Symmetry: D3
Subunit: 266 residues, 6 copies
Amino acid sequence: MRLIPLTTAEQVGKWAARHIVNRINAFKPTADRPFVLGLPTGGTPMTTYKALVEMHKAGQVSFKHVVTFNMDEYVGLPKEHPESYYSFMHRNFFDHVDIPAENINLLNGNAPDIDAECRQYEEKIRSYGKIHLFMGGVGNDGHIAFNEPASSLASRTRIKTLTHDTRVANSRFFDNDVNQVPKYALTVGVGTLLDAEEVMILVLGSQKALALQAAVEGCVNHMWTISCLQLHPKAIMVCDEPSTMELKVKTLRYFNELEAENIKGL
Amino acid sequence: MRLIPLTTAEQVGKWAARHIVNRINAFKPTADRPFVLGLPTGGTPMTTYKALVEMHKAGQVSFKHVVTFNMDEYVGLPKEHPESYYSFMHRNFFDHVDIPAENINLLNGNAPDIDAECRQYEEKIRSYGKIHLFMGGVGNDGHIAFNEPASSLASRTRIKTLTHDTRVANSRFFDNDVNQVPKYALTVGVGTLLDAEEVMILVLGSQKALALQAAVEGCVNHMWTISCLQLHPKAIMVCDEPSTMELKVKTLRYFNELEAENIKGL
Amino acid sequence: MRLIPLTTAEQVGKWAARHIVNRINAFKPTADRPFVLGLPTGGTPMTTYKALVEMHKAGQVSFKHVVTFNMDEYVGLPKEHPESYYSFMHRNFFDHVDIPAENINLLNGNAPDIDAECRQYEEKIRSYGKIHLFMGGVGNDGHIAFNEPASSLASRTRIKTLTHDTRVANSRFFDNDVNQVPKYALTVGVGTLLDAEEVMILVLGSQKALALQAAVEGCVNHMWTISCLQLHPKAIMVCDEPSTMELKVKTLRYFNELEAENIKGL
Amino acid sequence: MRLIPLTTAEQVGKWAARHIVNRINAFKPTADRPFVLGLPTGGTPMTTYKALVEMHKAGQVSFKHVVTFNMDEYVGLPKEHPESYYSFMHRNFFDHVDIPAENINLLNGNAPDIDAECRQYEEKIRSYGKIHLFMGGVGNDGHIAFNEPASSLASRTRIKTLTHDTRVANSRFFDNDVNQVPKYALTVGVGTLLDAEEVMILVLGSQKALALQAAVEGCVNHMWTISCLQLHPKAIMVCDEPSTMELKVKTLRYFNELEAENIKGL
Amino acid sequence: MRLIPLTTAEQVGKWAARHIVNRINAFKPTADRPFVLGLPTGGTPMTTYKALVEMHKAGQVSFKHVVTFNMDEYVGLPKEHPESYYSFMHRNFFDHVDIPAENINLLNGNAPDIDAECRQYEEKIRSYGKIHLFMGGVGNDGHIAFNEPASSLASRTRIKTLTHDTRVANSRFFDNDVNQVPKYALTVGVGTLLDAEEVMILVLGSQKALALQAAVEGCVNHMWTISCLQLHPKAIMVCDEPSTMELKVKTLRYFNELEAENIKGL
Amino acid sequence: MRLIPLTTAEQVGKWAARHIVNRINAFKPTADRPFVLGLPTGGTPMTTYKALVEMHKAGQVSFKHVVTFNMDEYVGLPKEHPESYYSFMHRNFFDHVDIPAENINLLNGNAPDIDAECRQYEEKIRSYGKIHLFMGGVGNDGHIAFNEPASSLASRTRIKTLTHDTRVANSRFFDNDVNQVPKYALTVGVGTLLDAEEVMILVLGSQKALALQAAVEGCVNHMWTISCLQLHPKAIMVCDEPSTMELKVKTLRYFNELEAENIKGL
Ligand SMILES: CC(=O)N[C@@H]1[C@@H](O)[C@H](O)[C@@H](COP(=O)(O)O)O[C@@H]1O
Ligand SMILES: CC(=O)N[C@@H]1[C@@H](O)[C@H](O)[C@@H](COP(=O)(O)O)O[C@@H]1O
Ligand SMILES: CC(=O)N[C@@H]1[C@@H](O)[C@H](O)[C@@H](COP(=O)(O)O)O[C@@H]1O
Ligand SMILES: CC(=O)N[C@@H]1[C@@H](O)[C@H](O)[C@@H](COP(=O)(O)O)O[C@@H]1O
Ligand SMILES: CC(=O)N[C@@H]1[C@@H](O)[C@H](O)[C@@H](COP(=O)(O)O)O[C@@H]1O
Ligand SMILES: CC(=O)N[C@@H]1[C@@H](O)[C@H](O)[C@@H](COP(=O)(O)O)O[C@@H]1O
């Protein structure tokens, strides 16, 4: 696992965007061989989306040949609701880039047949082969996507019932009313993520400090699903300062020496 | 992982039996495509066996097309001994149902070639493809089948030496004489169980409270082999009240909200 | 997992050598079907190398048909340096046995293309199929090979930056000057080791007590990479007395009863 | 320790306030023998001060012979500042009760000699002899009063430097500008608190769930000073529902039945 | 702390009983200066009372000038009930020794004013001044006397409500009917115990293995009140073999060599 | 607790030595009111004694009215032996300062009645009244003085039997022959230490990293007696860089800013 210890969310987003652009550009995607990118929503990826749009506008990247897959979506939330994940992704990313509409994949939380929706979603990823880079965040309770505590570390895309705390946390976007936050969501499983070629998790803020420690210094367990990355051959966690506060001095020292050159864009 | 928090062993057995019957019936087994069921012995599955026999007698299930595989068997215990696992399974289940004798699989603890016995057992499961549902219990020390502490989480069917505590625990059936409990047993491995399509563990009594916590809230480790279910994509633990006492309030609250409808047979 | 609780490093080496000889002899290697052995360096395997040379001289084993692969090698250390792993292996083993030079595999820490070196190394193991028995030691911090804390449990052969503590520990061989210990090394990954048919770890001295406990009684985690053996279907740890001091009385009692006969060569 | 498991903050306040009134009335304070009360600030005791004001107005209690001591005060913040603990206390409590100015004892955070201030404060308590009941809350990191992690469990009243985390927590009352909150504060020590005849801690909210677990289920340590209550002969923890989420089912079960009759008052 | 590692309960009793006799005889009790002895009930001290009776009959000790105090007593159970601690003590000890009735002090669980009872009890001890040796056992959850988990480490003699687990444990003496065991009990507190000049705890059985580990290797906390012995200047733990199974090899090693000569008495 | 985070042992010594001088000079010792100083041996305080000698020679401090007490002494080792703590103290400190022989108090490990020795020692301290400052180090397993793991947190001066590990640690001064180091030692107890008005512990080296974490972040327990400082009202830990490697980033951050001005002295 690589851990990039940065100072601010701004730097985090600049590092992540830069890494994505480099993967894409080094890959040289075509219409017959596209780059498959997995994406998250939430407050965490905002700086990364901001920097990506910039770079695109500056002619640094083209998503003309990039296929995207999102991690999850709320169940029973109208697609046009400002807070639906479909809305988020268009408002903050899709509307500003040159990605073909047929290249965008999102789960339908209003699918009449939930199981069919999830299976087809997995079948859609398979037809492309694999996700080259899956970007994500981490929940306060250590959840990756909506794979809440007690989720199988070998789980696939399926419906999950949101923890009360996740709902309270997400009430931010629902004018602080937990009663308005959807109780369920369609989400890719831990095994789905483990199948990605590279996984990049963004960690920002003190609220994630415990989740980072569980991920870095904790053991593999299903209560903190982010611990699954210990089993992934190519995981990177990009962090800011407050999120590293629960780590041991030696752990951070090691990562600091490691990424010294790699983080000095300046 | 799903955890069904019930109150009594009676309810546990009624839930388990019901789940098995539904799997079988929904599967619609034929002679060319049989349902493969993995089974345990011990005090734990008694209520489940009781309810299964009932349902069969009431014409709710037919084991005419069900192939069974048992988890383990004592080494060096005569097959006719009342306490041999072969005896247990016939006395409490086989004698009362319409399952063909050629459809029953049990390990021979008196096999002259222990390795040959175990290999053939694994070869027999393979010829059928896979075990559709493996039912089991959990030991006080967290063992699944006889995969005692320090057993490989990728182990296959093999011979294992019983822990002293397991023997003392099992002395119940040997008129409380530990000296009469077999020191060894042939058992399916953790990897053998992980290969099952669905795994259903029954947890009953306060003696299992620590094992349940290790399974639900603990990390993956080989000292408590029941933790292997965290790696299984389809595990269910059916519990009574005393076995949930070591769990965190939040953990039980989550599972209670989850199974509210699913447990209200009434 | 099997754990052989011996008393001295001498006995440890005699047990390990004996086990290797038995594997080789029982295997009956030919030029068309050679025995593939993975090997370590460091202070730990000295007694085992000593006993192996003896047995060979006594006509008990022939490495004429054995292919070897070493775990790691220092980056940027001249091959002729007495402390290079290449030097170690020739000085303490190769020079004294009848193994063909074309049967020896070592990583080139001076490879101009580090990635190419590591990939080819993995390709070389694959061409042979698999490593039949991989012998190794364990670091104070729980590292297996140079898979330092925070290494992926699914990692392959690659370059790794040595922890400061590992360097201080290895300064023994560099006349106690940490500044002389190479900062990097080419090493086989955890997944590379997990792929071996059998893994035998030698644990000697009180300095390894914490690493042994992490391995035996701890949970699977990437901070203590030796915990990966819990996932291996055929691991054995051969220990002396001081290295078992952190284990629970019950754990050692179990292993003592288990290996009573198997360790009484006398 | 007694732990009163309630559902709501309103209930906590009603319970706590009734407890104080009962103790005072049983004591029968007079001019020569006043009842000494220790009090806190923060959002936690708001419902309690409210209820207390209700009871006084209703003629249920009089503070005419109650001497009070507050836990702490910010250093350098002007007395008349709306957020000084002096203002909080008057705005929320003193302004509505019949307590004579003589009886109010608050730490002077703007004293010329901070060392002398703290010492005279401890002297004040001693002069009266003993604080009969000390009410307080608990910080998110378990700090009691301003005895931050790593404070001595035998500490007395002194100047203390706040944890960045505490400042972030308190920034709420300073328009969320961490730069606004005072870096230092005068506070009673853990020893001062342990000297109190009875200690009642109010726990409200999910943010305090870890602190509550540390206090009830953890060991005594100076990182979570709230754990010092395990050494107190008369300690009570009054909690609302979300604060008990990290406790064990058995832990909450025990307390629920103990306090059953004691909370049915409604 | 001293820990006497023995093999059998008979040895524990013989050791413990010799210790008491030695202390008494060294003390040279008289009418004005009696030796004060604290005593427990339960299955644990059976071998000790037996040995003690043997020694007295043999003319080795006399209790004519020994004042005794028992740890606890069930509330509401009639004195003459075969299971009241009053009956246990007489049936098993007093009936066979020369202790005058005056010297026997037991808690009256059927007193009209439970509060007054506990207080007078503490007064009794103070009148004599000090308990020279307090013998006791440890519950499965580490409770000492009836100071159940969450009791204050500074508690005094008071009424206590038993844990459901304790009641299940004690149901043995009530024909295994949990409904038969008293929900309450008067008991000496942890403080009362810590006031004893010397405390000797007998640990027998596998059921006490976790409690013994908590006491010796755990931290001080009120969940396992037996941990309070870490703060005692003169504490001894006398154990049989299965009770030491959760300790570390090094822990038991240390104690074994310390007590080597001390237990060879046979 | 205060923790002074320094980089080098030289800095630790300079800091610690300045602290002692400051305290002495502020105290203004005289013949009737001497300053009582507790002192340790071992490699840890070498830089401190050196600095102290420098300051005395420079006319900054005088020990003419300082009474000193040492923590411990080997039993059975002749006084004049180069490694007796008596020799260490004179060779390294007393020989260079103006302290009169009358003022030196060392434990006599070759006394005819070890019990009487320890008791008179405690009497010596009491006669002076109080040790104003006790300087000491911490063992690798966190033992303070020779109060090895499992010593009472309320212990007094007594004979103690060393842990094999401690002997291995001290064999350095006995030509690395463990057989050379004394199995027993007279030592001040944890209680004796807690009675000191102020306790300053010097922590140097990576070998002490776990002990430092136990002391600062662990719970109070008798396995790591250094944890007793959490109950002390005036404790200071002076550390070099590698000793802080197991602490949390936040823990070291806190202390760094507290002591910022306090260590800039250089
Ligand atoms: C409607 C609903 O919420 N269904 C989910 C199911 O999809 C999931 O598989 C299981 C937990 O299992 P997992 O997290 O291990 O997949 O919980 C619930 O049954
Ligand atoms: C006769 C006997 O008891 N043999 C078992 C062996 O079958 C098992 O493989 C090993 C533990 O390994 P495992 O639990 O990881 O398979 O212990 C013993 O050697
Ligand atoms: C030059 C160097 O040191 N490169 C390594 C890289 O090879 C390794 O993959 C990664 C940790 O990841 P891993 O331990 O999980 O493979 O750390 C560093 O980036
Ligand atoms: C100005 C200031 O912040 N002073 C405090 C001091 O009062 C306190 O004693 C010590 C920690 O110790 P304690 O928390 O154990 O008293 O830290 C700081 O030096
Ligand atoms: C009737 C009854 O059960 N009373 C006890 C009380 O005596 C005890 O003080 C408290 C717990 O506190 P302690 O264990 O810390 O004294 O719980 C209960 O209220
Ligand atoms: C000769 C010898 O080694 N005596 C000590 C004794 O002095 C000490 O009190 C006890 C442990 O108790 P403590 O460490 O709690 O005092 O162990 C040993 O018996």
